[PDB]
Design a protein around this ligand. Structure first.
Ligand code: 7PP
Ligand code: MG
Length: 209
């Protein structure tokens, strides 16, 4: 059973701006997603200090970057805290309203899209490179869910029947046809070294041959 939801209007606006604005420095999407993963890992790590059983769903804290040329996907996997259904449907959109407004105002006053993370809405930069984003997530207190959106004002959420992931988040970027450079090992390595070299969790870049 797939449920379909409308984004908050301000978030639909933001996604349209990200999709429509001419802006060549698209590579910053990766830093933003990796930062989100790091923050999610920090959260579970801290909670585990007071309740060690929170790592019963997995003790490894890491980030994997997985390109797949045949599927034209780049997947950012973390074993962080994960998101609940309420996060996916309501809470993330609600908290993002203020940051989205501030970002759009800053852009009008001379900021650029690479500053998106300063406003707490860097996830949406995925739409610089992806025509569709699928997010598979599992929080200790909730079931495994799949969220998905191709923009256009709506997103879907369903319970995920796929491979159970233990705990964490997988952001699957279905890349646009002209954005396949982000499947290349030398390109991803370049970007991680430039913008994510000090992240406090192991980042493993998977390869293909
Ligand atoms: C569903 O797609 C998203 C949307 C629509 C918005 N932002 C985000 C970014 N985001 C947000 C995370 C979170 C959370 C809730 C807590 C309480 C952990 O802050 C969160 C978490 Cl835990 N992990 C990661 N990797 N990204 C997260 C995503 C993935
Ligand atoms: Mg919304």
């Amino acid at each position: 059973e797939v449920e379909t939801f409308a984004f908050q209007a301000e978030i639909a606006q933001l996604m349209s701006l990200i999709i429509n604005t001419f802006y060549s420095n698209k590579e910053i999407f990766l830093r933003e997603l990796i930062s989100n993963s790091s923050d999610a890992l920090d959260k579970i790590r801290y909670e585990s200090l007071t309740d060690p059983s929170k790592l019963d769903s997995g003790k490894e804290l890491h980030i994997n970057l997985i390109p797949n040329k045949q599927d034209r996907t780049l997947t950012i996997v973390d074993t962080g805290i994960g998101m609940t259904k309420a996060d996916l449907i309501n809470n993330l959109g609600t908290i993002a309203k203020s940051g989205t407004k501030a970002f759009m105002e800053a852009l009008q006053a001379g900021a650029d899209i690479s500053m998106i993370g300063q406003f707490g809405v860097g996830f949406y930069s995925a739409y610089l490179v992806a025509e569709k984003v699928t997010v598979i997530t599992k929080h200790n207190d909730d079931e495994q869910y799949a969220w998905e959106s191709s923009a256009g004002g709506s997103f879907t959420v369903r319970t995920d029947t796929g491979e159970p992931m233990g705990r964490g988040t997988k952001v699957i970027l279905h890349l646009k046809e002209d954005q396949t450079e982000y499947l290349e090992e030398r390109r991803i390595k370049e970007i991680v070294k430039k913008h994510s070299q000090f992240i406090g969790y192991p980042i493993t870049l998977f390869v293909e041959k």
